[PDB]
Structure 1
Amino acid sequence: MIGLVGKKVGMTRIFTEDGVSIPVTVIEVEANRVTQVKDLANDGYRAIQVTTGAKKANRVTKPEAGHFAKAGVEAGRGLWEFRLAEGEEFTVGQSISVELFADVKKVDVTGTSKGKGFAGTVKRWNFRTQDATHGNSLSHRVPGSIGQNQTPGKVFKGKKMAGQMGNERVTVQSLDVVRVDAERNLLLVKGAVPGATGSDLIVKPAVKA
């Protein structure tokens, strides 16, 4: 089924009654109301478009304000379009609570990662540091050789080099869900999900069953 846009709220751990402790991530997942049910008429494909959160009305833009008061939904932060699965079918403005994750047991939380910045190759691609004594000169962390010689005559496309690491979008897969709460609107998933606190985690039921 569809996914749910929530917010990352830190990490904690839950002690089971029988003895183990599980590191969980708390995700506050508000109401994800639909602003546009796309279907095969004007798009060829079918989908929904959800929103959540809130903004100041003197901070939202006049195109987007008409895009939200078209549906009557309160203009929040972002929009996120989810692909439909031919069995479930929503309408415009139909709010979607946290209670789609009752019977499910595995999720795929996707969030924008934490940008480590311009990382060099040791931290970025796990290269190996050269010998930091024994004659070595000015070359303790540099990435070594990058190509062969006169026959290749260039570097191959997709050479692992240095540069921006993180602040990408990644996907943790197949997390065992822990506990879903109604009034608190919290989705406890086991283990780390990407991004620092305040991210926008899209949580959908896991495709690898």
Structure 2
Amino acid sequence: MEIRGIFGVKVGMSQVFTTNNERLPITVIYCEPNQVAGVKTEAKDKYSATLLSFDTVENKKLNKPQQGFFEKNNLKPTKHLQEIRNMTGFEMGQQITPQNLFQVGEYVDVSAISKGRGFTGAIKRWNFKIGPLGHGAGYPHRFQGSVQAGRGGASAQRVFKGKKMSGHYGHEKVTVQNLRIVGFDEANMLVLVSGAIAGPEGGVVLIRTAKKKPGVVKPIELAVQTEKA
């Protein structure tokens, strides 16, 4: 479908209190207005996509071909450029803000680069188990179990492709789906998203229309205080 998307950063995580009197955890996303830079039309190049440019920066802090592209296209220089598949209803050079794309409490999903953790063990990676600690189970007892598949020339004589062992973990794009929007703040270029947002604070976060539930909305109001003394 005609996917809606927008880019921002992650500045922390907090909570807010809503009607029905439940504590809702909140991630706060500083979403500076993006700027379309290319409209990939179905006719021109065999698919429909739109390219966003965000994280505006000074002209000097930019490579020469990139700055030349920006000057020739008559846009504002930005550090990052990315495109979203199946985004149609926008034209070149039009500024976009998250309030122009979303309701106050409808359904969106979020994809962002995860938090790196370096080379890690198998158990901490694949959620394996740990050999016994009593009765003297020997020293190599934090390992991925037996990788044996078959002993003898007939059976396997190898270790199968796509095994589960230790390796680099994290710092990879991940996606959490069906995270409700909670509120906007046009004054500070700010949006509110329920749930937990992947990635370390200060990174780059992407927001898209949820694929599982495109237009579904279950609105949530606030719980403005009534305590005075």
Band of TM-score, shorter chain: over 0.9
Matched residue, 2:118: 117
Kept in 2, the 8 Å contact 1:51–1:79? The answer is: yes
Matched residue, 1:93: 93
Kept in 1, the 8 Å contact 2:110–2:175? The answer is: yes
Report the Cα distance in structure 1 between the residues aligned to 2:105 and 2:66, rounded to whole angstroms.
Answer: 34
Q: Shift in Å at residue 42 of structure 1?
A: 3.3
Give the TM-score of the pair, scaled to structure 2.
0.85
Note if 1:172 corresponds to 2:187: no
Q: Shift in Å at residue 97 of structure 1?
A: 1.0
Matched residue, 2:27: 25
Report the Cα distance in structure 2 between the residues aligned to 1:63 and 1:52, rounded to whole angstroms.
Answer: 17
Q: Shift in Å at residue 96 of structure 1?
A: 0.6
For residues 113-140 of structure 1, the C-alpha deviation after alignment (integer angstroms, 9 at most, x for no partner) is 0011101111000110000121211122
Matched residue, 2:40: 38
SS class of match (2:67): helix
Q: Shift in Å at residue 39 of structure 1?
A: 1.0
Report the Cα distance in structure 1 between the residues aligned to 2:73 and 2:104, rounded to whole angstroms.
Answer: 30
Gapped regions of structure 2 (runs ≥ 5): 214-229
Matched residue, 1:129: 130
Q: 1:26 is aligned with what amino acid? A: V
Q: Shift in Å at residue 205 of structure 1?
A: 1.0
Kept in 1, the 8 Å contact 2:34–2:53? The answer is: yes
Report the Cα distance in structure 2 between the residues aligned to 1:46 and 1:58, rounded to whole angstroms.
Answer: 33
Matched residue, 1:83: 85
Note if 1:193 corresponds to 2:197: yes
Kept in 1, the 8 Å contact 2:104–2:182? The answer is: no
Matched residue, 2:61: 59
Q: 1:60 is aligned with what amino acid? A: L
Give the TM-score of the pair, scaled to structure 1.
0.93
Kept in 2, the 8 Å contact 1:101–1:180? The answer is: no
List structure 1 segments (4+ residues) > 3 angstroms apart after TM superposition. none
Q: 1:97 is aligned with what amino acid? A: T
SS class of match (1:66): helix
Q: Shift in Å at residue 40 of structure 1?
A: 2.7
2:16 is matched with which residue: 14, 30, 53? Answer: 14
Q: Shift in Å at residue 94 of structure 1?
A: 0.5
What count of residue pairs does the alignment treat as equivalent? 207
Matched residue, 1:74: 76
Q: Shift in Å at residue 93 of structure 1?
A: 0.4
Gapped regions of structure 1 (runs ≥ 5): none
The 1:76–1:115 alpha-carbon spacing in structure 2 relative to 1, beyond 3 Å, is: same
Q: CA RMSD in A?
A: 1.5
